Amino acid sequence: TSLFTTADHYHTPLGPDGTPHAFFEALRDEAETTPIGWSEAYGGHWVVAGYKEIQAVIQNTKAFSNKGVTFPRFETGEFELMMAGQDDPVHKKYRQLVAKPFSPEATDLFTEQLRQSTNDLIDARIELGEGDAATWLANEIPARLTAILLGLPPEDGDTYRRWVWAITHVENPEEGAEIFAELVAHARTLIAERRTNPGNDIMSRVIMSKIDGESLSEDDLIGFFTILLLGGIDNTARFLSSVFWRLAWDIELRRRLIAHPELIPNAVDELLRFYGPAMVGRLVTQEVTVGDITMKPGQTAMLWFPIASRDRSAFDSPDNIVIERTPNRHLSLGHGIHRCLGAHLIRVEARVAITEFLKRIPEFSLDPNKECEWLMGQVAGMLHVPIIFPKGKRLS
């Protein structure tokens, strides 16, 4: 019996703690023998689980194309995910347009405003003694950030969340496509406004940009809007919700972060290794051999980062959250030419969120009368994390 045969990142067995980690640990064990295996799911595809096998695949851009970055393909109609869905040379030119606003110096500019935002969100319920850390905090922090990056109203998070649900999780394709079509309609109006009244945001930036002398098509612009919205509302919210869930029951990890705030950035990196939401696919475009296995053009390889992140040949004690772990070269943010554009920004965001939360609410736990829930998929993590805590005071 192999766990690869029915491996499916949208349908991962959950264990008693509520997470797929027991399943990930079992798959990791098997990957020591078979680091790449065939899955029967989605009509058949390769599941790449070993650390060095994922490295080999992801560096080999000649045989493995980012046209398969989402598998099954995300619902973005006729639009492509910019950067993430392209290969070089096209990929490099698009990414170059937004490197500056994602650079560490550019994104550090938001730290103090992320800190205020986190404290304001906390104020909303600190007096209540209860709340869903996902919906109340983890979702809202990146949504509000992302709205400001894109020059959108920050109070319309429920609209952006609905768009992201359509792209990734609605299963009736009619609803899926239709709601993505609503994103497109909003995106066009914003582009038209920024065209005439340009601002500081990243959208105005790409709208005014040029490649080889020429403006970006409206479709290219919509692709930029789309992938940026996905990074914030989806990946970051799921990551933070898993972190909040962990901090809720893991009283040992929590007291250490409270006592050693200087360890929080390194801890954020270890939490990324352990709770990294993401997997990505690659479309095989050339016959290629990786380890014992020969892949053919047209096949897809799914890079199961959470398994590689637990590889005993790449990490000592991989099943433990070791907050002082260095160098910690996990694959949660990718590697090589497609390496996460928002890497530094999420590190700031997580450091701020954790810092402020533990500062305001040092004592809290999972609500024993409400359920947690894990969202499965290409972006995976806690979706509901009901917590209780002693009633406290607003800063406002």
Ligand X SMILES: CC1(C)O[C@]2(C)CC[C@H]1CC2
Q: Which residues are annotated as a binding site for heme?
A: 66, 91, 95, 282, 338, 340
- CB of 275: closest distance to ligand X in angstroms? 14
Structure tokens belonging to residue 296: 């053919």
Contacting residue, 316, 326, 368, 393, with Cl ion by CB under 5 A? 316
Residue 228 touching ligand HEM (CB under 6 A): yes
At residue 284, φ and ψ (nearest 5 deg) are: -75, 125
Task: For the segment 262-301, give every residue that binds ligand HEM (CB under 6 A).
Answer: 276-278, 280
Strand, helix or coil at 46? strand
Q: How far apart are CA 73 and CA 238, in angstroms?
A: 20
Q: From ligand X, ligand HEM, Cl ion, none, which one binds at residue 316 (CB under 5 to 8 Å depending on kind)?
A: Cl ion
Contacting residue, 45, 205, 254, 338, with ligand HEM by CB under 6 A? 338
x/- binding map, residues 83-122, to ligand X, per CB under 6 A?
A: -x--------------------------------------
Query: For residue 42, is it left (φ>0), alpha (ψ between -120 and 50) or beta?
Result: left
Residues annotated in a binding site for substrate? 235
- Stretch of 71-79, 117-125, 174-182, 227-235 lying at the interface with ligand HEM (CB under 6 A): 227-235
Residue 227 touching ligand X (CB under 6 A): yes
AA letter at 380: A
Does residue 165 contact residue 152 with C-beta atoms inside 8 Å? no
Structure tokens belonging to residue 83: 């950067």
Residue 20 touching ligand HEM (CB under 6 A): no
Q: Beta strand 300-303 with 280-284: parallel, antiparallel or unpaired?
A: antiparallel
The H-or-E segment that residue 215 falls in is strand 214-215
Q: Which residues pair with 282 in a beta bridge?
A: 301
x/- binding map, residues 274-303, to ligand X, per CB under 6 A?
A: ----x-x-----------------------
Ranges of H-type helices in 34-96: 51-59, 90-96
The residue count for binding ligand X (CB under 6 A) is 12
Residue 167 touching ligand X (CB under 6 A): no
Identify which of residues 27 and 341 has a Cβ nearer to ligand HEM in the complex: 341
Beta carbons within 8 Å of 38's beta carbon, 6+ residues apart: 4, 5, 44, 45, 46, 47
Looking at residue 301, the DSSP 8-state letter turns out to be: E
The residue count for binding ligand HEM (CB under 6 A) is 26
Beta carbons within 8 Å of 171's beta carbon, 6+ residues apart: none
Strand, helix or coil at 220? helix
Residue 334 touching ligand HEM (CB under 6 A): yes
Contacting residue, 119, 332, 355, 378, with ligand HEM by CB under 6 A? 332
AA letter at 332: S
Residue 134 touching ligand HEM (CB under 6 A): no
Does residue 173 contact residue 260 with C-beta atoms inside 8 Å? no
Residues that bind ligand HEM (CB under 6 A): 66, 69, 83-84, 91, 95, 227-228, 231-232, 235-236, 239, 276-278, 280, 332-334, 338, 340-342, 345-346
Residues that bind ligand X (CB under 6 A): 69-70, 81, 84, 227, 230-231, 235, 278, 280, 378-379
